Enzyme design. Structure first.
Site, PDB file in Angstrom:
ATOM      1  N   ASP A  44       0.861  -1.193   0.000  1.00 42.59           N
ATOM      2  CA  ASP A  44       0.000   0.000   0.000  1.00 42.59           C
ATOM      3  C   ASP A  44       0.896   1.242   0.000  1.00 42.59           C
ATOM      4  OD1 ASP A  44      -2.804   1.172   0.483  1.00 42.59           O
ATOM      5  OD2 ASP A  44      -1.519   2.242   1.948  1.00 42.59           O
ATOM      6  N   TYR A  49       3.021  10.142   0.522  1.00 47.94           N
ATOM      7  CA  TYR A  49       4.014   9.587   1.453  1.00 47.94           C
ATOM      8  C   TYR A  49       5.441   9.942   1.057  1.00 47.94           C
ATOM      9  CZ  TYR A  49       0.001   6.649   2.817  1.00 47.94           C
ATOM     10  OH  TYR A  49      -1.246   6.169   3.171  1.00 47.94           O
ATOM     11  N   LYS A  78      -2.656   5.979  -4.347  1.00 49.20           N
ATOM     12  CA  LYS A  78      -3.758   6.868  -4.013  1.00 49.20           C
ATOM     13  C   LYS A  78      -3.507   8.247  -4.644  1.00 49.20           C
ATOM     14  CE  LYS A  78      -3.796   4.592   0.531  1.00 49.20           C
ATOM     15  NZ  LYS A  78      -2.335   4.514   0.805  1.00 49.20           N
ATOM     16  N   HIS A 111      -7.677   9.331  -2.284  1.00 46.74           N
ATOM     17  CA  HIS A 111      -7.102   9.234  -0.929  1.00 46.74           C
ATOM     18  C   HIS A 111      -8.060   9.775   0.158  1.00 46.74           C
ATOM     19  CE1 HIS A 111      -2.934   9.123   1.162  1.00 46.74           C
ATOM     20  NE2 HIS A 111      -3.876   8.816   2.042  1.00 46.74           N
TER      21      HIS A 111
END
Ligand code: NAP
Length: 316
Positions: A44, A49, A78, A111
């Protein structure tokens, strides 16, 4: 316990994946390499990030090493909130594909249901703390997600942090072409989510549980906050089964027919966390863990509580 769940696009998704939020860029390549070596087949990811390039280095090396075939991996990313406009979705997806070394994603999620003003900053601010919204709504962003399926960039599309009215809005969209395959939501014994899980599963949408260990490394942790991994009642269930507390916390959502994505960059814990297909919690254990619900969230998106599409005012 079978290893994969069937999605409403006809593909199968591994029920245990590796999370990557907060995994440092200098550690996440080895984390993902170790994970694939010890059996993980689902990673994931997300652009926000800031570590997809490093995740991709690991994926690409294990494919080159023929440790695994691309068809056996299930890679999720996402769409960040600053890319909800129609004309930015494809480029956002393509940047993630480039970074991850892939020519398709298995699953691409919106997201959050909240769109923000496009630009370099992930959380654009006005002069006072507020997040500057986009005027593009969940339904036009969903149409742009559907286009990615039809262009071959993603196998499946889904949503994350949508409340039931927002999932319903998608399901009721005029001209809906593809239903969401997944809703990825926070879920653990302190935020058990019965109402929203029940709703999504009744509609054929698979639920993925994030922060299953209570995210002890979340940046905004306070000492006073509850702590799943230190809760003596959960430690007692783990001791009964001769498992670690983390293993109980991972097995719990699996037995609710959820997918679960614990994060670690520690090799021993990555391997630990995968060893959950070898025991079963009783129904009594499951009901006991459910009874610890406190409606406590790791991820409450606190800078966005006035956004029209903020998801957590709603009971569920
Ligand atoms: N869709 C969304 O909006 C959203 C939001 C939050 C999370 N997520 C996804 O869900 C993933 C998981 O959630 P999360 O990262 O918030 O937290 P989590 O998986 O609940 O917890 C991660 C923390 O637990 C530690 N840990 C892992 N295994 C352990 C074990 N066996 N024993 C003791 N401690 C252990 C990790 O430490 P070390 O890493 O140092 O080993 C890390 O500090 C994320 O990484 C991300 O992929 C998605």
């Amino acid at each position: 316990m079978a290893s994969r769940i069937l999605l409403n696009n006809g593909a199968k998704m591994p029920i245990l994946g590796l999370g990557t939020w907060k995994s440092p860029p200098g550690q996440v390549t080895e984390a993902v390499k170790v994970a694939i070596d010890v059996g993980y087949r689902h990673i994931d990811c997300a652009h926000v990030y800031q570590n997809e390039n490093e995740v991709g280095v690991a994926i690409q090396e294990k494919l080159r090493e023929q440790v695994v075939k691309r068809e056996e991996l299930f890679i999720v990313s996402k769409l960040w909130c600053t890319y909800h406009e129609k004309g930015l979705v494809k480029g956002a997806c393509q940047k993630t594909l480039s970074d991850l070394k892939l020519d398709y994603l298995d699953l691409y999620l919106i997201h959050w249901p909240t769109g923000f003003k496009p630009g370099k900053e992930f959380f654009p601010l006005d002069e006072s703390g507020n997040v500057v919204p986009s005027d593009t709504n969940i339904l036009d962003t969903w149409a742009a997600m559907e286009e990615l399926v039809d262009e071959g960039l993603v196998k499946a599309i889904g949503i994350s942090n949508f409340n039931h009215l927002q999932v319903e809005m998608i399901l009721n969209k005029p001209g809906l072409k593809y239903k969401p395959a997944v809703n990825q939501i926070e879920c653990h014994p302190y935020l058990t989510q019965e109402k929203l899980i029940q709703y999504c599963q009744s509609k054929g949408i698979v639920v993925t549980a994030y922060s299953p260990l209570g995210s002890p490394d979340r940046p905004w942790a306070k000492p006073e906050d509850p702590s799943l991994l230190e809760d003596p009642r959960i430690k007692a269930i783990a001791a009964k089964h001769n498992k670690t507390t983390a293993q109980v916390l991972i097995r719990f959502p699996m037995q609710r027919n959820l997918v679960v994505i614990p994060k670690s960059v520690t090799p021993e814990r990555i391997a630990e966390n995968f060893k959950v297909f070898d025991f079963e919690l009783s129904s009594q254990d499951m009901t006991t863990l459910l009874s610890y619900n406190r409606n406590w969230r790791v991820c409450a998106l606190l800078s966005c509580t006035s956004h029209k599409d903020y998801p957590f005012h709603e009971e569920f």
